[PDB]
Amino acid sequence: SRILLNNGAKMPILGLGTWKSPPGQVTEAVKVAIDVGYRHIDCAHVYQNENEVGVAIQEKLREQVVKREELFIVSKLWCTYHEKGLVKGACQKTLSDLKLDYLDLYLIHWPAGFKPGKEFFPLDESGNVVPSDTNILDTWAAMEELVDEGLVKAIGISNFNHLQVEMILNKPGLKYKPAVNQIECHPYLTQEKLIQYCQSKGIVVTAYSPLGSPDRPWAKPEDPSLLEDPRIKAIAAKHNKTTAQVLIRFPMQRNLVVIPKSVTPERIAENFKVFDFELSSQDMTTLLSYNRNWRVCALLSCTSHKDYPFHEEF
Numbered sequence: 164s165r166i167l168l169n170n171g172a173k174m175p176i177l178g179l180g181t182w183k184s185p186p187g188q189v190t191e192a193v194k195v196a197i198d199v200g201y202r203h204i205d206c207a208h209v210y211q212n213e214n215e216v217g218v219a220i221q222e223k224l225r226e227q228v229v230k231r232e233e234l235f236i237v238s239k240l241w242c243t244y245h246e247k248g249l250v251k252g253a254c255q256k257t258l259s260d261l262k263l264d265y266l267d268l269y270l271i272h273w274p275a276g277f278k279p280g281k282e283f284f285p286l287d288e289s290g291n292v293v294p295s296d297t298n299i300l301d302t303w304a305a306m307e308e309l310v311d312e313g314l315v316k317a318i319g320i321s322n323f324n325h326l327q328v329e330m331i332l333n334k335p336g337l338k339y340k341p342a343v344n345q346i347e348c349h350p351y352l353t354q355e356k357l358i359q360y361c362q363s364k365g366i367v368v369t370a371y372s373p374l375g376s377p378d379r380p381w382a383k384p385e386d387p388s389l390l391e392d393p394r395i396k397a398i399a400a401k402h403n404k405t406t407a408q409v410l411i412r413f414p415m416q417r418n419l420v421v422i423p424k425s426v427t428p429e430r431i432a433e434n435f436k437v438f439d440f441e442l443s444s445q446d447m448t449t450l451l452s453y454n455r456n457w458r459v460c461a462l463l464s465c466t467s468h469k470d471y472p473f474h475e476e477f
């Protein structure tokens with residue numbers, strides 16, 4: 164149920180996603196998740212609900228349902244806080260909202276820095292994102308400091324391409340290697356080269372949007388839909404499992420961590436019932452065959468940012 168990281172800690176391979184979970188619904192979602200066995204929650208300041216996740220964790224610690232050490236809480240540094248002088252503050256805001264005294268894992272959410280300010284997506288008058296003059300290595304150095312101060316137990320990255328990961332690995336005077344790279348991954352974006360790269364470097368990969376993020380705010384009717392894919396439905400029926408369970412089990416069998424999101428109590432429970440079956444070799448082969456290099460998360464207004472990750476092949 165857990166994978167070993169480079170800091171010696173164990174990370175649950177199944178966690179609960181919280182992007183697009185509205186504040187109060189998310190408090191109940193986390194309480195239910197904890198009750199049915201989730202021990203990893205994936206959070207972010209930019210999801211605007213960390214206080215409400217915090218409420219849930221606090222209450223279940225209080226109810227004596229779980230201990231803090233049994234939980235694996237992840238959050239992420241948003242793009243507008245990449246300046247070295249803003250990182251600790253950003254982390255401490257997350258810690259305050261989550262009502263925690265440490266995070267198990269803290270990620271650089273995206274490799275690009277954005278102009279500091281109240282707005283999470285600062286745009287100019289023609290709709291281009293406004294970058295900041297920050298770079299990956301300086302931001303990484305600031306993340307390292309959080310480990311040395313005890314605010315976070317591990318640090319890692321998200322939406323980094325292999326060249327961007329290499330920049331960190333090859334930093335002279337590197338203090339901590341990235342523990343995790345959290346990237347989009349599902350049957351329509353199978354990430355074979357980046358996953359190979361990362362695993363060969365002892366970096367654990369977490370798959371986000373494993374169900375294809377049907378609630379993403381920029382979905383178009385014509386877009387491919389994983390949960391509705393009749394080929395995957397047929398694989399699921401064969402196992403007497405739902406399509407969602409097949410989609411969650413798939414990355415587990417590639418030695419990935421996976422973080423499906425739900426605020427629907429029955430689905431929260433359903434998505435955790437994935438340790439009692441196995442996809443076969445043919446199933447695995449078939450699911451990888453559906454790759455189309457189709458991305459849920461890739462914001463158009465950021466495509467000219469110096470650090471845009473997805474111009475590179477991988």
Ligand SMILES: NC(=O)c1ccc[n+]([C@@H]2O[C@H](COP(=O)([O-])OP(=O)(O)OC[C@H]3O[C@@H](n4cnc5c(N)ncnc54)[C@H](OP(=O)(O)O)[C@@H]3O)[C@@H](O)[C@H]2O)c1
Binds near residue numbers: 181206322378390
């Ligand atoms: N690091 C990054 O840049 C990044 C980017 C995107 C996502 N992520 C993380 O990854 C998580 C997962 O990605 P995601 O939120 O994009 O989408 P996802 O987990 O692929 O899909 C969530 C959508 O699927 C629905 N759903 C969940 N379980 C279902 C089931 N059993 N049957 C049918 N529908 C189901 C949910 O509906 P209800 O909630 O209404 O039940 C919601 O609409 C996020 O929440 C976030 O924590 C990280």
Ligand SMILES: O=C(O)Cc1nn(Cc2nc3cc(C(F)(F)F)ccc3s2)c(=O)c2ccccc12
Binds near residue numbers: 465
């Ligand atoms: O962020 C999430 O967890 C999900 C996520 N994804 N996207 C697509 C993005 N594409 C990006 C590209 C860059 C870039 F690095 F390329 F500049 C930087 C930042 C982004 S946000 C969003 O637009 C978004 C908006 C609010 C909350 C979460 C998200």
